[PDB]
């Protein structure tokens, strides 16, 4: 009795981002998320990150007020070089270096995430999880929408959902979602900027075929503040006992950082028969980015500041109070081709019915690089004394900066070509033999991968073969619970290079999990919980004799539970919350052993609860808030220190505005950081911190047509 109520929990329950088939989540022997439109459409969340908040195993804030990625830690673990691991439409939106591409949560249908190896379907992944977004489709039901949003930071954005068959049989519709976004960053002096619009049209000659074409373009001129922050001034006070204001900007004045998206593929599924069911996913990307940007590194007292001269060139006791920096230009762009086909074969044997998967996955990257970074001394340094608390009271942008002039004294021309590419077969079946489920498969791939240093002029290329597999059972009830238990296995090809001048060998994901998942057919409520023991095999470690080199052979392990509630306690109350207890410890490692990675807290917690009025003069009137805790974390390898826990609270007030003729319409106004808290949300080291999102009001009016 409201479009995220129960509605949303029932469609919930059906995903397929874990078995490549279409499969309720009871019946899926590993741990899987799945979020709504309906429920992104209520919480207004401003990237995919947000929209994933109440699910557990994820820290989805990591790098704080930034935006320019969705980049996230799931079960302690991120990909290689943390890059992205992200899909949309089972396709993985390969990326590299600082091309990674991101999509707009009001151009999708719902997001899933996968926690731990998952190669037993897509390949080469990083153990601990893998994000699938899914494309808005055309509907049934004609749609005319447009929505228009003022908040504060001046946030202007103002976009449009239209959906119609051309045809009153509706073997021919479309879809076509735009949205135009501007504010200003946290940060004094960045701004952001967006422009996007998805195309998409659907085919369907019959009730068994679908050819559904999806595009997406997007234009980021700027995507606003993505910089480092000393853990002096930030987690630590200064020298002075004071701090750095949270709108803190140490980057240039003229810093810039733009992104260029460009897609077009397509979804494919055509019912044979009984038996027979074909799906093929193609997809084609051509992405850019480019930026000119002064970053933070570090106060002159840290020891990533020995051999600066700048810094040496100060009173010992000065060292701590005032902050070095650097800066890279790039220029990036890369093409991404994917083709996933698969036959789906359904037969029984005898009373145990079979959904035989089998397929062949293909990907292609390429990402031509044209960078220049500023090493010690690049950069002019900043006094953080003035940051006062004048400035907690406003915020003063930094000065220009030369990016040309590329002094070859203090920095270098960065200039890559890297190639991927990586084919694999996998065999699935999921096996009923009533009430008993039992899911294996298993799948080698070929992934080669090519490096140009067009600076250097050499060549580095590998290409592994590799092997995966993956079995588990749910036995399923019939009053709602099912237990389950599996095991799963994943590989991460390296691109580093040893001393030996060759690409290391990959790492590997092993998981060992077991929980059960409560989904009562017969109440729109969903339970489910969970314990795994994850480890990373073969992890990059230093050399045992300082050589600049890494080596391979470290290991790590994560084993936590997990706890994911969502259920609509009544006619107007519905609740989401999970709980997270995350032992990430490394396992072997030369410098490290014993201390866990930075940026995983232990503890992580958040619920939700919102209520909606039937009642007297405050008919469909939405009131809903919700709390998110993020546990204390270590801001570095070696655990020199640690950045603290927090609480953060957010709520909206939204009223169904079909109490004035307009019906399917509404207006909202989203508060985040409601007690507007001030907290680093993270450091991935000594000099790289970052601010959490301080309070923000959005106003939202979203108008049916
Ligand atoms: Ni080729």
Known sequence: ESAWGPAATIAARQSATGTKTDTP???????????????????????????????????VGTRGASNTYDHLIIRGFAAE???????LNGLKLQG??????????????????MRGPVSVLYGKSSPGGLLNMVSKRPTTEPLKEVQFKAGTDSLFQTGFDFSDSLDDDGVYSYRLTGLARSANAQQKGSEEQRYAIAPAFTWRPDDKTNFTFLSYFQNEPETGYYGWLPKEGTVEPLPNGKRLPTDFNEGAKNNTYSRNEKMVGYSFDHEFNDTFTVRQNLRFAENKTSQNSVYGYGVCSDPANAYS?????????????????????DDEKLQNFSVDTQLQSKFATGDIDHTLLTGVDFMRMRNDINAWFGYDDSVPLLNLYNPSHHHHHHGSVNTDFD?????????????????????????????????????????????????????????????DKQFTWRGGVNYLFDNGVTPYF??????????????????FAPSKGK???????????DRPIVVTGAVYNLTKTNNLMADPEGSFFSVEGGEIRARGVEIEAKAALSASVNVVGS??????????????????????????????????????????????????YTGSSYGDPANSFKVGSYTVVDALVRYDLARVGMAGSNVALHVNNLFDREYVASCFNTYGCFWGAERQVVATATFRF
């Not at 600082?98 to 719902?110: F, G, S």
């Not at 599996?486 to 690409?503: L, T």
């Not at 609860?609 to 008919?619: E, V």
Request: glycine letters at 8%; aromatic letters at 12%; one cysteine or more.
């Open 25 to 59: 989540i009871q019946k899926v022997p590993q741990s899987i998320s799945v979020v709504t439109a309906e429920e992104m459409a209520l919480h207004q969340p401003k990237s995919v990150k947000e929209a994933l908040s109440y699910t557990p195993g994820v820290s």
């Open 81 to 87: 070089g943390q890059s992205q691991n992200n899909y």
């Open 96 to 113: 590299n270096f600082y091309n990674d591409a991101v999509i707009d949560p009001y151009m999708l249908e719902r997001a899933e995430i």
């Open 309 to 329: 001269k700048q810094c040496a060139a100060l009173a010992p006791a000065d060292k701590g109070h005032y902050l070095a920096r650097k800066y890279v230009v």
């Open 403 to 463: 990016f040309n002039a590329k002094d070859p004294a203090n920095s270098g021309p960065y200039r890559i070509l890297n190639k991927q590419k990586q084919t694999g077969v996998y065999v699935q079946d999921q096996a009923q033999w009533d009430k008993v489920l039992v899911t294996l498969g298993g799948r080698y791939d070929w992934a080669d991968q090519e490096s140009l240093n067009r600076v250097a002029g050499t060549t580095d290329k590998r290409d």
């Open 486 to 503: 599996s095991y799963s296995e994943s590989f991460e090809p390296s691109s580093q290079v040893g001393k030996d001048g060759n690409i």
């Open 511 to 521: 998981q060992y999990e077991v929980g059960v998942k409560y989904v009562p057919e």
């Open 579 to 628: 709980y997270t207890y995350t032992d990430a410890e490394y396992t072997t490692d030369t410098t490290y052993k014993g201390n866990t990675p930075a940026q995983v807290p232990k503890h992580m917690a958040s619920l939700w609860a919102d209520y909606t009025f039937f009642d007297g003069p405050l008919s469909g009137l939405t009131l809903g808030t919700g709390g998110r």
